[PDB]
Design a protein around this nucleic acid. Structure first.
Ligand SMILES: [Mg+2]
Ligand SMILES: [Mg+2]
Ligand SMILES: [Mg+2]
Ligand SMILES: [Mg+2]
Ligand SMILES: [Mg+2]
Ligand SMILES: [Mg+2]
Ligand SMILES: [Mg+2]
Ligand SMILES: [Mg+2]
Ligand SMILES: [Mg+2]
Ligand SMILES: [Mg+2]
Ligand SMILES: [Mg+2]
Ligand SMILES: [Mg+2]
Ligand SMILES: [Mg+2]
Ligand SMILES: [Mg+2]
Ligand SMILES: [Mg+2]
Ligand SMILES: [Mg+2]
Ligand SMILES: [Mg+2]
Ligand SMILES: [Mg+2]
Ligand SMILES: [Mg+2]
Ligand SMILES: [Mg+2]
Ligand SMILES: [Mg+2]
Ligand SMILES: [Mg+2]
Ligand SMILES: [Mg+2]
Ligand SMILES: [Mg+2]
Ligand SMILES: [Mg+2]
Ligand SMILES: [Mg+2]
Ligand SMILES: [Mg+2]
Ligand SMILES: [Mg+2]
Ligand SMILES: [Mg+2]
Ligand SMILES: [Mg+2]
Ligand SMILES: [Mg+2]
Ligand SMILES: [Mg+2]
Ligand SMILES: [Mg+2]
Ligand SMILES: [Mg+2]
Ligand SMILES: [Mg+2]
Ligand SMILES: [Mg+2]
Ligand SMILES: [Mg+2]
Ligand SMILES: [Mg+2]
Ligand SMILES: [Mg+2]
Ligand SMILES: [Mg+2]
Ligand SMILES: [Mg+2]
Ligand SMILES: [Mg+2]
Ligand SMILES: [Mg+2]
Ligand SMILES: [Mg+2]
Ligand SMILES: [Mg+2]
Ligand SMILES: [Mg+2]
Ligand SMILES: [Mg+2]
Ligand SMILES: [Mg+2]
Ligand SMILES: [Mg+2]
Ligand SMILES: [Mg+2]
Ligand SMILES: [Mg+2]
Ligand SMILES: [Mg+2]
Ligand SMILES: [Mg+2]
Ligand SMILES: [Mg+2]
Ligand SMILES: [Mg+2]
Ligand SMILES: [Mg+2]
Ligand SMILES: [Mg+2]
Ligand SMILES: [Mg+2]
Ligand SMILES: [Mg+2]
Ligand SMILES: [Mg+2]
Ligand SMILES: [Mg+2]
Ligand SMILES: [Mg+2]
Ligand SMILES: [Mg+2]
Ligand SMILES: [Mg+2]
Ligand SMILES: [Mg+2]
Ligand SMILES: [Mg+2]
Ligand SMILES: [Mg+2]
Ligand SMILES: [Mg+2]
Ligand SMILES: [Mg+2]
Ligand SMILES: [Mg+2]
Ligand SMILES: [Mg+2]
Ligand SMILES: [Mg+2]
Ligand SMILES: [Mg+2]
Ligand SMILES: [Mg+2]
Ligand SMILES: [Mg+2]
Ligand SMILES: [Mg+2]
Ligand SMILES: [Mg+2]
Ligand SMILES: [Mg+2]
Ligand SMILES: [Mg+2]
Ligand SMILES: [Mg+2]
Ligand SMILES: [Mg+2]
Ligand SMILES: [Mg+2]
Ligand SMILES: [Mg+2]
Ligand SMILES: [Mg+2]
Ligand SMILES: [Mg+2]
Ligand SMILES: [Mg+2]
Ligand SMILES: [Mg+2]
Ligand SMILES: [Mg+2]
Ligand SMILES: [Mg+2]
Ligand SMILES: [Mg+2]
Ligand SMILES: [Mg+2]
Ligand SMILES: [Mg+2]
Ligand SMILES: [Mg+2]
Ligand SMILES: [Mg+2]
Ligand SMILES: [Mg+2]
Ligand SMILES: [Mg+2]
Ligand SMILES: [Mg+2]
Ligand SMILES: [Mg+2]
Ligand SMILES: [Mg+2]
Ligand SMILES: [Mg+2]
Ligand SMILES: [Mg+2]
Ligand SMILES: [Mg+2]
Ligand SMILES: [Mg+2]
Ligand SMILES: [Mg+2]
Ligand SMILES: [Mg+2]
Ligand SMILES: [Mg+2]
Ligand SMILES: [Mg+2]
Ligand SMILES: [Mg+2]
Ligand SMILES: [Mg+2]
Ligand SMILES: [Mg+2]
Ligand SMILES: [Mg+2]
Ligand SMILES: [Mg+2]
Ligand SMILES: [Mg+2]
Ligand SMILES: [Mg+2]
Ligand SMILES: [Mg+2]
Ligand SMILES: [Mg+2]
Ligand SMILES: [Mg+2]
Ligand SMILES: [Mg+2]
Ligand SMILES: [Mg+2]
Ligand SMILES: [Mg+2]
Ligand SMILES: [Mg+2]
Ligand SMILES: [Mg+2]
Ligand SMILES: [Mg+2]
Ligand SMILES: [Mg+2]
Ligand SMILES: [Mg+2]
Ligand SMILES: [Mg+2]
Ligand SMILES: [Mg+2]
Ligand SMILES: [Mg+2]
Ligand SMILES: [Mg+2]
Ligand SMILES: [Mg+2]
Ligand SMILES: [Mg+2]
Ligand SMILES: [Mg+2]
Ligand SMILES: [Mg+2]
Ligand SMILES: [Mg+2]
Ligand SMILES: [Mg+2]
Ligand SMILES: [Mg+2]
Ligand SMILES: [Mg+2]
Ligand SMILES: [Mg+2]
Ligand SMILES: [Mg+2]
Ligand SMILES: [Mg+2]
Ligand SMILES: [Mg+2]
Ligand SMILES: [Mg+2]
Ligand SMILES: [Mg+2]
Ligand SMILES: [Mg+2]
Ligand SMILES: [Mg+2]
Ligand SMILES: [Mg+2]
Ligand SMILES: [Mg+2]
Ligand SMILES: [Mg+2]
Ligand SMILES: [Mg+2]
Ligand SMILES: [Mg+2]
Ligand SMILES: [Mg+2]
Ligand SMILES: [Mg+2]
Ligand SMILES: [Mg+2]
Ligand SMILES: [Mg+2]
Ligand SMILES: [Mg+2]
Ligand SMILES: [Mg+2]
Ligand SMILES: [Mg+2]
Ligand SMILES: [Mg+2]
Ligand SMILES: [Mg+2]
Ligand SMILES: [Mg+2]
Ligand SMILES: [Mg+2]
Ligand SMILES: [Mg+2]
Ligand SMILES: [Mg+2]
Ligand SMILES: [Mg+2]
Ligand SMILES: [Mg+2]
Ligand SMILES: [Mg+2]
Ligand SMILES: [Mg+2]
Ligand SMILES: [Mg+2]
Ligand SMILES: [Mg+2]
Ligand SMILES: [Mg+2]
Ligand SMILES: [Mg+2]
Ligand SMILES: [Mg+2]
Ligand SMILES: [Mg+2]
Ligand SMILES: [Mg+2]
Ligand SMILES: [Mg+2]
Ligand SMILES: [Mg+2]
Ligand SMILES: [Mg+2]
Ligand SMILES: [Mg+2]
Ligand SMILES: [Mg+2]
Ligand SMILES: [Mg+2]
Ligand SMILES: [Mg+2]
Ligand SMILES: [Mg+2]
Ligand SMILES: [Mg+2]
Ligand SMILES: [Mg+2]
Ligand SMILES: [Mg+2]
Ligand SMILES: [Mg+2]
Ligand SMILES: [Mg+2]
Ligand SMILES: [Mg+2]
Ligand SMILES: [Mg+2]
Ligand SMILES: [Mg+2]
Ligand SMILES: [Mg+2]
Ligand SMILES: [Mg+2]
Ligand SMILES: [Mg+2]
Ligand SMILES: [Mg+2]
Ligand SMILES: [Mg+2]
Ligand SMILES: [Mg+2]
Ligand SMILES: [Mg+2]
Ligand SMILES: [Mg+2]
Ligand SMILES: [Mg+2]
Ligand SMILES: [Mg+2]
Ligand SMILES: [Mg+2]
Ligand SMILES: [Mg+2]
Ligand SMILES: [Mg+2]
Ligand SMILES: [Mg+2]
Ligand SMILES: [Mg+2]
Ligand SMILES: [Mg+2]
Ligand SMILES: [Zn+2]
Lengths: 131, 118, 204, 59, 22, 122
RNA sequence: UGGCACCUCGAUGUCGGCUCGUCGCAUCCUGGGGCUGAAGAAGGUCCCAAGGGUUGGGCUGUUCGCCCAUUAAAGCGGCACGCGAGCUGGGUUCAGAACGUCGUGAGACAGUUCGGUCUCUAUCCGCCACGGGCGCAGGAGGCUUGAGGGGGGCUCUUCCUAGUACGAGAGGACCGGAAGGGACGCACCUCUGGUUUCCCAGCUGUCCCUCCAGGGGCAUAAGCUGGGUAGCCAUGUGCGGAAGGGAUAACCGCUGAAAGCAUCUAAGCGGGAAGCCCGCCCCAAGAUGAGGCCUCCCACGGCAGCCGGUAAGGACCCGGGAAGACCACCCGGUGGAUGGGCCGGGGGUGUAAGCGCCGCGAGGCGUUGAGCCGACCGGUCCCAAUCGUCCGAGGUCU
RNA sequence: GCGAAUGCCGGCAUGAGUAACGAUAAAGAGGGUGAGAAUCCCUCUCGCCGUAAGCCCAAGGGUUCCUACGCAAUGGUCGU
RNA sequence: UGAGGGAAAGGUGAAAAGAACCCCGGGAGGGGAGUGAAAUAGAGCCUGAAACCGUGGGCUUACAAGCAGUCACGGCCCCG
C-alpha cells in the first residue's frame, strides 16, 4: 500500500481547481458563504495575503486587512467549499514567503515594501486576451 | 524520542559535524578508500555521493556547489575530470562501506573501510 | 458485535455540511476468517481473522499448516474479534455504514522512559526562586515513619506508550469499499502504518 | 542530598549473586569461505583479505 | 494544628569541616 | 484568550478606555475567556465623566481576541487586540455605540444588541 | 493548651510554602431520605452516603485570618502538627548592627530591625520501569479464557414541559425531554499554534580561496536576522464519566401474627442512593491452582540416566524501526525494497549561478517560481543486509 | 590468657567493574616506525589563543636543557 | 616557614653449588634441563597462621519468610 496515495484518494473528492493562483503580497477578495440565523449570505473579505501554508488539499492561506481601525486576519482553506470565488484585486511583490512583518508597518510603509508586481500584472492582462 | 529523525550527531556539535563530514569527503575523494569507525563511515556514504553525483552533472554551478564543501580546486578537478566520469551510467551508489574484522586497540572501536566504486 | 483488522493510514479532514471533519483513514478489509472459536470447542465465541497477505516463503510449517486447514492463503497478522460470528468467510469494511459509531484499539506511540511530567502531568518544580536541580522532579513520594513505605502504583517515571489503547465511540464518516477504506472521525492510537482493530462501539 | 552510604557490608554470597549476569559470550565466528580460517561474519576476512568472493584487502 | 509556637530544637546546619586529619 | 490580569480595550462609548480582567464568568474555574464570554473586570483607564469611571468593577463581554478563534467551517479569524463592550446584568451594552468589528460568535451567544450597533461583523 | 518524663542528647533537623499524595468521616458540594412553624421556589433540622469534586486574586513568613471576584461547593481532620538522603529557606537558635527597655557594668529580652554557608555517588526494604534464569513431564510456532488486579467514578447553565401545578401577588416546581459548558482523563497532529543546531534566504565585521564574480571559517555550545517539512507538542482535535443489570443504606411500604385491634417482621414479598456488585478501559496463567484452542516435528544412534547427530523450530551475525538507556519488542536479510544513494512527488525557501540589457553608480530588469532542498509519500537492486555457525524432541510412573 | 576501649599497628574485604578519568578550543585521514599505535614521527585537512594561551626579564625551582639507548614504575587511558 | 615532629624496613642454603643450554614470550613470566638432603629453600627466598581471592570435587538449592541455629526423621555421598 501507498499510504500517501490513499489519502490523496480520499481528499480527491474535495479538491477544487476553479480558484485563481495568487501569492503573498497579492491583494485578494474572498467571497465567503456565511450563516447568520437565518439567511446565509456571501460576505466578501478583501485584504493582503500574508501567508500561504502548503500541504496539498490542506493548504491554507491568510488574509490581513484593516477594518475600522482594528486589523483583521482571517484564515481560509484553499479548498473550502465555503469560498465562492477569489478575485485578484492586485498583484504585490514580496521578497519572502511569510509576510508577518506588515503587522507592525504604517499604511505608508507597507505600500513601500509591497510595490505593484508589475511583471505578474502585465501577465494577467496577457490572459483575458481570450478567444 | 527521536521518532523519524535522519542523521547522527556523532557526539559533535553542528559546526564540527559538518567539518567532520567534509574532511572525510576530502580524504575519501583523495585516496579512494579510507578507514574509519563504522558509524562515521555509514554517514560518509551519502555525503560523498551527492558531491560525486554533482560532479557528474559537470556544470559550473555544480562545481561551485561541490566546491563549497571540498574547498580544493585541484581536488574538485580530479573529482570532475577523473572521478565523475566512471559513473556516467551508474545511477547512484557511488560508494560502498565494508566492515573490518578487527576492533581498534585503545578503545575497541569497530572499524570499516569506505571506498569509491568502479 | 462485528469487528475488523486494519492499518492506520493517516489524517486529513473532509468537508461535510460546511464543516471540517477531522478524520483518520484506516485500510480495513479484507480479512479472511481463519478460525472460529466455539463454546463446545473453545469455551467461548469469536472469529480469528487474518489480515495482510504474506510471502509463503516466510511462513513456517506450524503456521502454514494452520492456514492450510482453514483453506486460506497466508496472512501477516492473526487477531480474534470477540463474540462475533460473520456469516461469510471474509470480513470487509462493508460491515460498517457511515454514521455508525465505533471503538478503535491500536498501540499508542512509545515515549520511552518518560519523566513524571510527560507521563503523569506532574507540576514539576519552580524554575527560579531557588529551585535546586528539581525542575521536573516528582517532589515527595512518601510520608514518614508511618507508613514508612511507598504505595503500589505510586505515579512515577517509567516507560510510557507503545501500549494498547482503545479509543471509543468514534463516528464512521464514510466507507469506501472500492478501496477498503474506513474514515473514522477524530483520532486513533498509533503511528500511521500501525495496526488497528475497529469494533462496533459499546457506548449506547 | 545527604550522602547515601551502604548500611551493611555486602556478603560474599550477595555480590556474587549480583555478578550472575557478568559472564561474557564468546565472539560469534564463522569460517571464511576462501581460506577456511575462522572470522567474525560480515567482516572482510583479515587472514586472506577476501569478502563476497573477491580480494578486498592486501594483508 | 498547634498554636503554642513550636521552637526548633536544633540549629540549622551547618558550620565547617574537620578537614583534614592527615 | 482573556484571563485575569489581561488588559482589554473597551470598544464602546461608556468612557472606559482600558479594562483589566478579573474573572472569567464561565464555570466555576474557567482558564480563559474568548469571544462572547463575560468577564468581570476592573476599569483601569477611563476618560473624564463617562458613565463609567476608573476603579469601577464592571461586566463586559469579549468581542475581539488577539488569539484566533477557530470556526467549524475549518476557517479562523483573529484580531489586532482584545476588546470588550461593557454590559449590564442582562447582557445589554451600557454604551450607546460600539466601534470596530466584532466577531460573529457574539450573535450565536445572544448579544445581538452589540452586534447591530457594531459597524462590522466578521 | 497542659500534665507526666517512657525510647531516642556517641543527633529523631524543627515554622510556613512547593511538590506528591493517601486515609478518616463528626459531609462543604453533588446522590438518597424523615420532620418542618414544608403552599411554591427557597430554607431549617436530623438521618444514609467517602464515588467524584472542593476555584483565582489582595494583605502578611505566616499557618490562621480578613478582604475582592467567582462558585455546585469554595468541608474539617490524620498520616513524626504527612512529605528538607524531594526542593525551598521568607520565619524561629549562633557569630555583625541598631532601636525601645533592663542592668553601674560585661550584657540581657515568650520584644522590634537589616544581614547571615541547607551535604554530586542509594547497600537493603519500598516504589516506578525493563530484562536475565528456571519452571510450567515430549519438543515447537501461533491464537486465546480471565482467577485476580488496576484505571475511571465530577458537576453546571439554558431551553422544552410550563409562566403550567402551587400562590392575593411577587415568585415558581416535581416528573419527563433537548441543547450548550467548566474543570479533569486517554489518545491524536487533519486544522489552529509552537519548536524545528543548518532545510532555504538576507545581513555585518574579519581571515581566507583566486584578482573580479562567486564562495568558505569565526563571531555560541546556530555570529545575527527573516522563515520553516517530518517529528515531538497544546493553546489545537477526537473521545471518556455512562447506559444498563443486580444486591443494599436511611427511608417508605404489601401481606401478618404473638397481642380478637394495631404493627414493614416474628413467616414471607415489594420499592429505595453520586455510594456496593457487575458492566467500560488497561494489566494479568510464576493463577507453581503455571488453564485452553489451532497447527508443526516424532518413534535417532551407544552404554524418569548420560552422550552425539538431527526434526519442527530457535538463537547467533547483519540491515533496520514513530521499539528502545542496555536488554526486550517488531520488520528485513538478494526467494530482498531493510537502511544508503539515485529518481519522482511532497515541503521549505522565494526568482541560484552564469549571461544579455538599463543606470556613472549603489542597483534594477529578464532568462526564472529559478536554484538550493533533512526526516514526509513512493519508485528503483546502483551501494550495503556476502558467506555462514551453533542450539534444539526420541516423550516418568498407577 | 582479649572480642569489643568511634582502642593501637598491619593485612585484606564491602561499596563496584560503580562515581570518576580535572575546563564543551575539536577533530579527520594518509604515510611511517614498531612485537604492540585513537595516543610517537611526518604530510594534508579542520578548529582554538593572539594585551595571548605569543615573546622577553625578574623571583622561585635546581639539570628538568641537548643527544643516544629504554618502557618496570611515574603519566588519571595508551605509549614505540 | 621555623623551633620542632619523625617512621617503615631483619632471616635462601651447609655451601652460590644463585640454575649453562634449549623451548614459548618484545620482555615479564614460565616449561624443561642442571644444583641441592630439600627448590611450594629460586632469590617477590626459613617457618609460612588468619582474614581475603580462586580452581576442582560431594551434598544441596528457582512456591520460599530468615539472629541463620538447634532437636527429629528421611534422601544422597564418603569411610569401614
Ligand atoms: Mg501524508
Ligand atoms: Mg491507491
Ligand atoms: Mg458586510
Ligand atoms: Mg521512542
Ligand atoms: Mg530530546
Ligand atoms: Mg528512518
Ligand atoms: Mg547532519
Ligand atoms: Mg538518529
Ligand atoms: Mg568527541
Ligand atoms: Mg563520550
Ligand atoms: Mg550544536
Ligand atoms: Mg559555531
Ligand atoms: Mg558490510
Ligand atoms: Mg565486529
Ligand atoms: Mg592503543
Ligand atoms: Mg493490536
Ligand atoms: Mg519528570
Ligand atoms: Mg500524559
Ligand atoms: Mg502537559
Ligand atoms: Mg505548577
Ligand atoms: Mg513548569
Ligand atoms: Mg519560580
Ligand atoms: Mg540555595
Ligand atoms: Mg536550575
Ligand atoms: Mg509500616
Ligand atoms: Mg515498551
Ligand atoms: Mg461524505
Ligand atoms: Mg502519526
Ligand atoms: Mg541522594
Ligand atoms: Mg547540591
Ligand atoms: Mg557527606
Ligand atoms: Mg554520596
Ligand atoms: Mg547507612
Ligand atoms: Mg566479601
Ligand atoms: Mg564464591
Ligand atoms: Mg546483591
Ligand atoms: Mg481614583
Ligand atoms: Mg506536656
Ligand atoms: Mg525519659
Ligand atoms: Mg522529654
Ligand atoms: Mg521523652
Ligand atoms: Mg535528643
Ligand atoms: Mg552513630
Ligand atoms: Mg546511633
Ligand atoms: Mg548521627
Ligand atoms: Mg531519620
Ligand atoms: Mg532526616
Ligand atoms: Mg490531607
Ligand atoms: Mg477520604
Ligand atoms: Mg455519618
Ligand atoms: Mg442534597
Ligand atoms: Mg430535608
Ligand atoms: Mg419544597
Ligand atoms: Mg414558608
Ligand atoms: Mg413559603
Ligand atoms: Mg432525622
Ligand atoms: Mg432519620
Ligand atoms: Mg467523597
Ligand atoms: Mg478527600
Ligand atoms: Mg497571597
Ligand atoms: Mg501588587
Ligand atoms: Mg495569609
Ligand atoms: Mg508581600
Ligand atoms: Mg513577625
Ligand atoms: Mg494572623
Ligand atoms: Mg443552592
Ligand atoms: Mg481561598
Ligand atoms: Mg519532618
Ligand atoms: Mg498537616
Ligand atoms: Mg510537618
Ligand atoms: Mg516538613
Ligand atoms: Mg534541606
Ligand atoms: Mg519544611
Ligand atoms: Mg525526609
Ligand atoms: Mg531522612
Ligand atoms: Mg523532589
Ligand atoms: Mg525578614
Ligand atoms: Mg533569616
Ligand atoms: Mg546575627
Ligand atoms: Mg536601630
Ligand atoms: Mg535608648
Ligand atoms: Mg526589659
Ligand atoms: Mg541602670
Ligand atoms: Mg541606664
Ligand atoms: Mg540567658
Ligand atoms: Mg545583602
Ligand atoms: Mg532575622
Ligand atoms: Mg539540603
Ligand atoms: Mg543550596
Ligand atoms: Mg556510587
Ligand atoms: Mg540499590
Ligand atoms: Mg532492609
Ligand atoms: Mg520473565
Ligand atoms: Mg526469559
Ligand atoms: Mg511473532
Ligand atoms: Mg477455557
Ligand atoms: Mg476481573
Ligand atoms: Mg498473586
Ligand atoms: Mg413557560
Ligand atoms: Mg457533559
Ligand atoms: Mg482538554
Ligand atoms: Mg503535518
Ligand atoms: Mg502543526
Ligand atoms: Mg497543520
Ligand atoms: Mg504552524
Ligand atoms: Mg548547509
Ligand atoms: Mg564572511
Ligand atoms: Mg593564496
Ligand atoms: Mg570579493
Ligand atoms: Mg580561521
Ligand atoms: Mg579565533
Ligand atoms: Mg567557537
Ligand atoms: Mg552559517
Ligand atoms: Mg514562527
Ligand atoms: Mg530562527
Ligand atoms: Mg514542523
Ligand atoms: Mg488543553
Ligand atoms: Mg447504577
Ligand atoms: Mg432492586
Ligand atoms: Mg396492614
Ligand atoms: Mg393488645
Ligand atoms: Mg423476616
Ligand atoms: Mg426489593
Ligand atoms: Mg426490603
Ligand atoms: Mg412501594
Ligand atoms: Mg454520574
Ligand atoms: Mg496474555
Ligand atoms: Mg490482553
Ligand atoms: Mg502458561
Ligand atoms: Mg495463592
Ligand atoms: Mg499453557
Ligand atoms: Mg539487532
Ligand atoms: Mg538499534
Ligand atoms: Mg528474523
Ligand atoms: Mg543468510
Ligand atoms: Mg531502499
Ligand atoms: Mg529508498
Ligand atoms: Mg527526494
Ligand atoms: Mg517538486
Ligand atoms: Mg512547492
Ligand atoms: Mg531576478
Ligand atoms: Mg540570476
Ligand atoms: Mg555599463
Ligand atoms: Mg524534490
Ligand atoms: Mg538525501
Ligand atoms: Mg523491482
Ligand atoms: Mg562461511
Ligand atoms: Mg569483653
Ligand atoms: Mg567508623
Ligand atoms: Mg572504625
Ligand atoms: Mg556505626
Ligand atoms: Mg583497630
Ligand atoms: Mg581490632
Ligand atoms: Mg586498623
Ligand atoms: Mg587501618
Ligand atoms: Mg571490589
Ligand atoms: Mg556497568
Ligand atoms: Mg551502585
Ligand atoms: Mg551510573
Ligand atoms: Mg576528580
Ligand atoms: Mg561515567
Ligand atoms: Mg575532560
Ligand atoms: Mg560552555
Ligand atoms: Mg596508519
Ligand atoms: Mg598509540
Ligand atoms: Mg601501542
Ligand atoms: Mg594515525
Ligand atoms: Mg586527544
Ligand atoms: Mg601526528
Ligand atoms: Mg568549532
Ligand atoms: Mg592583535
Ligand atoms: Mg632578588
Ligand atoms: Mg637563579
Ligand atoms: Mg621542586
Ligand atoms: Mg638549552
Ligand atoms: Mg636530560
Ligand atoms: Mg628533553
Ligand atoms: Mg628516542
Ligand atoms: Mg612505562
Ligand atoms: Mg609495556
Ligand atoms: Mg606500558
Ligand atoms: Mg630496569
Ligand atoms: Mg602510572
Ligand atoms: Mg599507564
Ligand atoms: Mg592525574
Ligand atoms: Mg609535632
Ligand atoms: Mg644460612
Ligand atoms: Mg647466610
Ligand atoms: Mg645443613
Ligand atoms: Mg632463554
Ligand atoms: Mg624471544
Ligand atoms: Mg620494540
Ligand atoms: Mg628467564
Ligand atoms: Mg613456560
Ligand atoms: Mg626456568
Ligand atoms: Mg639430583
Ligand atoms: Mg635424611
Ligand atoms: Mg613446604
Ligand atoms: Mg623449605
Ligand atoms: Mg618460603
Ligand atoms: Mg633454617
Ligand atoms: Mg607464599
Ligand atoms: Mg565450587
Ligand atoms: Mg502458592
Ligand atoms: Mg521447590
Ligand atoms: Mg541427618
Ligand atoms: Zn580468508
Amino acid at each position: 500500500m501507498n499510504r500517501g496515495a490513499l489519502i490523496k484518494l480520499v481528499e480527491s473528492r474535495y479538491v477544487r481547481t476553479d480558484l485563481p493562483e495568487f501569492r503573498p503580497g497579492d491583494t485578494v477578495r474572498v467571497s465567503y458563504k456565511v450563516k447568520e440565523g437565518n439567511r446565509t449570505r456571501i460576505q466578501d473579505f478583501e485584504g493582503i495575503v500574508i501567508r500561504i501554508r502548503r500541504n496539498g488539499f490542506n493548504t491554507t492561506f491568510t488574509v490581513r486587512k484593516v477594518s475600522y481601525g482594528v486589523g483583521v486576519e482571517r484564515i481560509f482553506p484553499l479548498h473550502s467549499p465555503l469560498i465562492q470565488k477569489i478575485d485578484i484585486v492586485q498583484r504585490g511583490r514580496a521578497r519572502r514567503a511569510k509576510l508577518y512583518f506588515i503587522r507592525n508597518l504604517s499604511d505608508r510603509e507597507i505600500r513601500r515594501k509591497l510595490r505593484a508586481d508589475r511583471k505578474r500584472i502585465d501577465q494577467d492582462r496577457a490572459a483575458e486576451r481570450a478567444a | 524520542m527521536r521518532h523519524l529523525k535522519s542523521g547522527r550527531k556523532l557526539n559533535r556539535h553542528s559546526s564540527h559535524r559538518l567539518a567532520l563530514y567534509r574532511n572525510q569527503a576530502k580524504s575519501l575523494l583523495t585516496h579512494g578508500r579510507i578507514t574509519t569507525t563504522v558509524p562515521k563511515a555509514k554517514e560518509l556514504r551519502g555525503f560523498v555521493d551527492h558531491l560525486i553525483h554533482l560532479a557528474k552533472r559537470g556544470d559550473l554551478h555544480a562545481r561551485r556547489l561541490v566546491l563549497r564543501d571540498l574547498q580544493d580546486v585541484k581536488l574538485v578537478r580530479k573529482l570532475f575530470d577523473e572521478i565523475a566520469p566512471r559513473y556516467r551510467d551508474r545511477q547512484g551508489g557511488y560508494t560502498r562501506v565494508l566492515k573490518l574484522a578487527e576492533r581498534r586497540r585503545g578503545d575497541g572501536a569497530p572499524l570499516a573501510l569506505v571506498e569509491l566504486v568502479e | 458485535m462485528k469487528g475488523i483488522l486494519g492499518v492506520k493510514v493517516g489524517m486529513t479532514r473532509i468537508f461535510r455540511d460546511d464543516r471540517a471533519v477531522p478524520v483518520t483513514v484506516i485500510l480495513a478489509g479484507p480479512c479472511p476468517v481463519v478460525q472460529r472459536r466455539t463454546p463446545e470447542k473453545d469455551g467461548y465465541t469469536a472469529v480469528q481473522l487474518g489480515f495482510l497477505p504474506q510471502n509463503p516463503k516466510r511462513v513456517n510449517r506450524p503456521l502454514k499448516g494452520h492456514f492450510a486447514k482453514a483453506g486460506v492463503e497466508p496472512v501477516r497478522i492473526l487477531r480474534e474479534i470477540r463474540d462475533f460470528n460473520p456469516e461469510g468467510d471474509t470480513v470487509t469494511v462493508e460491515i460498517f455504514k457511515p454514521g455508525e459509531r465505533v471503538d478503535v484499539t491500536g498501540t499508542s506511540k512509545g515515549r520511552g522512559f518518560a519523566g513524571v511530567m510527560k507521563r503523569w502531568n506532574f507540576a514539576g518544580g519552580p524554575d527560579s526562586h531557588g529551585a535546586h536541580k528539581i525542575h521536573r522532579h516528582p517532589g515527595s513520594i512518601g510520608n514518614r515513619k508511618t507508613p514508612g513505605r511507598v504505595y503500589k502504583g505510586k505515579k512515577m517515571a517509567g516507560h510510557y506508550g507503545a501500549e494498547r489503547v482503545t479509543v471509543m465511540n468514534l463516528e464512521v464518516v464514510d466507507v469506501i469499499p472500492e478501496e477498503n477504506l474506513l474514515l473514522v472521525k477524530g483520532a486513533v492510537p498509533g503511528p500511521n502504518g500501525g495496526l488497528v482493530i475497529v469494533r462496533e462501539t459499546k457506548k449506547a | 542530598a545527604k550522602h547515601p552510604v551502604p548500611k551493611k557490608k555486602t556478603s560474599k554470597a550477595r555480590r556474587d549473586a549480583r555478578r550472575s549476569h557478568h559472564a561474557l559470550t564468546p565472539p560469534t565466528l564463522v569460517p571464511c569461505p576462501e581460506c577456511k580460517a575462522m572470522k567474525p561474519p560480515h567482516t572482510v576476512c583479515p587472514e586472506c583479505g577476501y569478502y563476497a568472493g573477491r580480494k578486498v584487502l592486501e594483508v | 494544628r498547634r498554636i503554642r509556637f513550636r521552637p526548633p530544637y536544633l540549629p540549622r546546619p551547618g558550620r565547617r569541616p574537620r578537614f583534614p586529619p592527615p | 484568550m482573556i484571563q485575569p490580569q489581561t488588559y482589554l480595550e473597551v470598544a464602546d462609548n461608556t468612557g472606559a478606555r482600558k479594562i483589566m480582567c478579573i474573572r472569567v464568568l464561565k464555570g466555576s474555574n474557567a482558564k480563559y475567556a474568548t469571544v462572547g464570554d463575560v468577564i468581570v473586570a476592573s476599569v483601569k483607564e477611563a476618560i473624564p465623566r463617562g458613565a463609567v469611571k476608573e476603579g469601577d468593577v464592571v461586566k463586559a463581554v469579549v468581542v475581539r481576541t488577539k488569539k484566533e478563534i477557530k470556526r467549524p467551517d475549518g476557517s479562523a479569524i483573529r484580531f489586532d487586540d482584545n476588546a470588550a463592550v461593557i454590559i449590564n446584568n442582562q447582557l445589554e451594552p451600557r454604551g450607546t455605540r460600539v466601534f470596530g468589528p466584532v466577531a460573529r460568535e457574539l450573535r450565536e451567544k445572544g448579544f445581538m444588541k452589540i452586534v447591530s450597533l457594531a459597524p462590522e461583523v466578521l
